[PDB]
């Protein structure tokens, strides 16, 4: 009964309003460091020279951004993949210039969101739950792994990471399609199949359960009060929803098993976003999308342009214009 077994009685306790857990002894101080440093960098970070060529990019709000154009600008290309903590720099103003706040945020966010995943395991193990809400969170977490760490590692610089910003994200998407042809990558296409299907099967499952709610209330109050929390009766008729959706397409396209239904709701966006994060993680090492430039040619040999040749001219448009001053050489290798 020392203050260690009293400490593990607090850390592992389910009686906490917000569960700590042992993963949360890493998750809380990393993600508070990644949240305090984020909003300070989002409002007051002086402009970061991301591309290493002494042209600073204003990201913060005080320097003439709004929330849409605001960002934490990624660390300098002069740094590359180098570890840039505060103690690497001679001053703070040097650390602020070369994008050190980006490396502070993403190393505290990814280490803290990895420990969000095991904290999601840990509460499932304290509660007696089955454990795989962590496995489903590995789909957005690999995505955060990819665009913050893995795509920098393959490309050799944290300047290639996704900027912590709304329009910095759109910069990251445009440049990625210019260099890696992400739309023609099938792993991104399985990811769009994971999020379009995910939004479909959300609105599907959301509307078939709402369609099938048993009358418990009057039309003079909300149907939401037909559910009382913790009730043992199912609040909607699963046989009617299967009877509805089975007649909607055909009977055998339909999950008349609620558990087999919610595995599919679990697995379709998760395996979708898994493959999409594997899209970014494999286009980290420049395993680009499908390159059908000048594929259809005629009998003479004249290139008959396709829709993938129209994308290629748009891809050319972004890539000759991304980082207009950073390239001194004709091939964009990394």
């Amino acid at each position: 009964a020392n203050l260690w077994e009293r400490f593990c009685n607090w850390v592992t306790s389910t009686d906490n309003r917000l569960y700590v857990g042992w993963f949360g002894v890493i998750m809380i101080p990393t993600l508070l460091a990644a949240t305090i440093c984020f909003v300070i960098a989002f409002i007051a970070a002086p402009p970061v020279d991301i591309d290493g060529i002494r042209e600073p990019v204003s990201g913060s709000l005080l320097y003439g951004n709004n929330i849409i154009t605001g960002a934490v600008v990624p660390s300098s290309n002069a740094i590359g993949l180098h570890f840039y903590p505060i103690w690497e720099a001679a001053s703070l103003d040097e650390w602020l210039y070369n994008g050190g706040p980006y490396q502070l945020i993403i190393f505290h966010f990814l280490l803290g969101a990895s420990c969000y995943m095991g904290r999601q395991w840990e509460l499932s193990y304290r509660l007696g739950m089955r454990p795989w809400i962590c496995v489903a969170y590995s789909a957005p977490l690999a995505s955060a792994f990819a665009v913050f760490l893995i795509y920098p590692i393959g490309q050799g610089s944290f300047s290639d990471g996704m900027p912590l910003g709304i329009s910095g994200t759109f910069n990251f998407m445009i440049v990625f399609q210019a260099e890696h042809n992400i739309l023609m990558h099938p792993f991104h296409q399985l990811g769009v199949a994971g999020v379009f299907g995910g939004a479909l099967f959300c609105a599907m499952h959301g509307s078939l359960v709402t369609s099938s709610l048993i009358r418990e209330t009057t039309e003079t109050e909300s149907a939401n009060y037909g559910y009382k929390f913790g009730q043992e009766e199912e609040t909607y008729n699963i046989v009617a929803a299967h009877g509805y959706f089975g007649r909607l397409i055909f009977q055998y396209a339909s999950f008349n098993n609620s558990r087999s239904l919610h595995f599919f709701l679990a697995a379709w966006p998760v395996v979708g976003v898994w493959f999409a994060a594997l899209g970014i993680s494999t286009m980290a090492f420049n395993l680009n999308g499908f390159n059908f430039n000048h594929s259809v040619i005629d009998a003479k040999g004249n290139v008959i342009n396709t829709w993938a040749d129209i994308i290629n001219r748009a891809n050319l448009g972004m890539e000759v214009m991304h980082e207009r001053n950073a390239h001194n050489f004709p091939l964009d290798l990394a």
Partner: peptide, 30 residues
């Protein structure tokens, strides 16, 4: 007839408005 608005609906409906205005303030200032 009385209007019922429980506290979650105050909380989501304020969340709906504040993240709408955090979005659109960049465009309203333009």
């Amino acid at each position: 007839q009385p209007v019922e608005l429980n506290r979650t609906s105050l909380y989501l409906g304020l969340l709906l408005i504040l993240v709408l205005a955090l979005l659109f303030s960049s465009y309203f200032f333009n």
